């Protein structure tokens, strides 16, 4: 796992960086606004997935997680169990192939 | 005793042979405690055995050869339902003189005993031989004597023995015989329990007791034909016989004596663990309240539990020291508590309460261990031996852990009375060399070396057999050969190198200074886990970092307290602002997780704000408080925040990089950050997240001894520390330690005014936009972007505006609470209205300090 | 008794807990299989930890090997005890005196270091570091 965990406004352009993106780690980038570069939908851009969060915490508005529950060892154990369980389900169903899973919302947003 | 046991179990080939035989085949004959098959009991090893007669002969053969050499042995034999008879007469002497007990008197006593047996028992008809033995105490102590009477040949039941024993208690002849011998109470000479308790095997003894020495043995031959004819003759040449085998009541294969047919768990833990034995020896040193009072008892049981998982029986035993508190709590609470402190704390308490017994016990332990090594290897000492005895001797003062560089590092626990730096007490200090462990090995260890020197000399003085004297002479010789080596530099260095393994305590470095609730101060260690305490005694808390300020409890009447409070009130006269600033700065001593807040505290100069910041920095010290360059903000230095608790800055109109501040307020960030200046900064951003965590405040009062001297004053620093910790405690009690919950209307208004004056978007939102529950007009991200465009063009400057970037800025701005997703997947404005040129607020549309009579620092009971 | 002797005996005695392989730095490195009942950091159970120096081996040679020395001690002492021919008894006495002369050396620091260095070759398990942590499952 490699997290690009923050940003300011629109992200910078990344054509040479995406040429490098085309390695044994999962990648994710966590901006609030759109990146300054993109490519052909069957060229180097074929690997980009996009998704935008909808719900807001304050059905898109909802009411210790950040400072208390994050550091609890039992919470981390439970999340590890969740991760291994989902890995088991993906392995049993899709044989470990991530493209076979249907994600119309992510595909549409991308 | 164990030392003599050691000595006696080497130079005495027979002792070693017997132990080897017992260990190699007699272990398969072991019996679980309480088994009736037990016949031989080892009062030392605590192990009971069941031997067949064939191997019993060889065992008795081993018991005879060992006995003749004077070895001290503590065996026992189990006599049960059908065995021989034994009589004990613990004579109580009127005077210190030992009665003679000539052979004629003993023969008369044997005659009387057989008379009582004949009257009070049924014996087989025919010719039988009954053997009598008289073992006498070697010396009469304080007018107290005794002797034993053994009848292995006879075989009767326990009821018969009890009847006989009761009968002898009424024998006038024996009573009158003992009368002239100086017996105070002849009637109490006999033990009625003589038929019940298992008896010592011949040659054995009790701990710290000399064995009963055989005086003489009589032979009696009885026949049924002439019951009134009682011949008695001394047995001739007894010393040539297997005395242990003959005198064994249970043995049936004696050469002379013939068969005439007529809780443990605690002991096992103690015997299988020398360390548990040592703890038991030192646990009796504690005062009575450490098992009846719940806090102390809980601390003790916790220390035992953390020490190891098998100390339960000691925890039971120590809890069982009081009958009523073993039942009013105790027997159930022990299970609860069993399901941070270790033996070092108990060890220190034992020193504190019983110092002299503490010293005697520890010195005896050192002597025993060191002599065990000496006895084990003929007086030749190597590095690991002395390393172990030093670790047992001063294992409560040093800890060694491998640092990041892969080199072992020695830490010292500083105690009062040693040379040191200022502010270095009751902590741990890094040492390149264990210098005190080099001096200690040469000086204090020499005392333990001496003690064994006089030990060996004394054993030389005692009258022993020639081989023992020769062997002691050789052992002493090798010992002084090995004695001077503790002064050799190479030997000492090797001993330190070997001891680096014993003193190793893993994870000391990564558990060092991790607690944010503990602080290192000049007079000790400060504690803020609970409100209100200073640790100025022995403790297990791993504190290395420290600051030179001494800590004292809050004394309001102190002149420095009043002076600093007056300066504080003069600098910030506003009650709300002063209280908020003090509660915010009270977190500077706290080195844990923060609330991600930063302040831009402006001022007109010579207002005392720089004085206040300097005071905080000096009080916290360079270890906890650091100066941060402002040049990072306008642009290695990030690492300066490590472990700190306070950060600060100290030209005209600097430009602040939003990325630097975003990265700063994000190892973890555990420092309180403040920015000080005389010129207002320029902030080139509009994101609400960055701005909401920022504050702006301006010092106003101008002043027209503090600046250069009173800051250097140690008393002023101590008083300010008391002030600061008192605000921290007050903030924790009142608002659960939260700085956002403190109301500071002046500071909040100043921050809003600065933000509006610097950011155009915020002032636009607060002026040209008014929230309206009625007016829910769809101010779509696009439309409102345009309206801002004309707003900026017609109010500030003519510039080209882009819809996308302005919409993105508005997304993360303060309006985000009012933007909701339309069904068309487009951002729209809901429940709000825009004011156009010359437009005023409509109805229902809203824009988007009790001075105490008492002292302001005093407890205000107005939540 | 010399270094390689005790090195082989120790390898037989604890060959199931330590692995030595030289890294790219050209220095031999000790690995230890952590078992329950020992001091350790959190989560370091049933896993191999990099040790700068084999503290466990250094202590082990002093304590547990001493048991075997002791057993040989009473073994030869028992042969002394039994009635044998005079030359045999003299041989056993000489072997004894030698035994005790060589017995204390296991506590010596330099001897312990030499034994460790000699055992570094016996405990060597090629390709260990390269195959370390390679399985993604």
Author numbering:
A (entry chain M): 688 to 709, 728 to 763, 771 to 775, 779 to 825
B (entry chain G): 10 to 271, 287 to 363, 372 to 564, 566 to 668, 678 to 692, 695 to 710, 726 to 763, 779 to 922, ...
C (entry chain M): 413 to 549
Paper text:
To gain more insights into the assembly of C962R, the apo protein was subjected to 300 kV cryo-EM analysis. The diameter of the outer ring is about 140 Å; and, the height of the C962R dodecamer is approximately 290 Å. The C962R structure was refined up to an overall resolution of 3.67 Å. The domain is of α/β fold in nature and was termed Tail domain hereafter. Dodecamerization of C962R is mediated by the AEP domains, mainly through the hydrophobic interactions between the side chains of His120 and Tyr238 residues. In the apo structure, the six Tail domains are symmetrically arranged along the central axis; the diameter of the inner ring is approximately 50 Å.
The N-terminal AEP domain is responsible for the DNA polymerization activity, whereas the DNA unwinding activity is catalyzed by the central SF3 helicase domain. The middle PriCT2 and D5_N domains and the C-terminal Tail domain all contribute to the DNA unwinding activity of C962R.
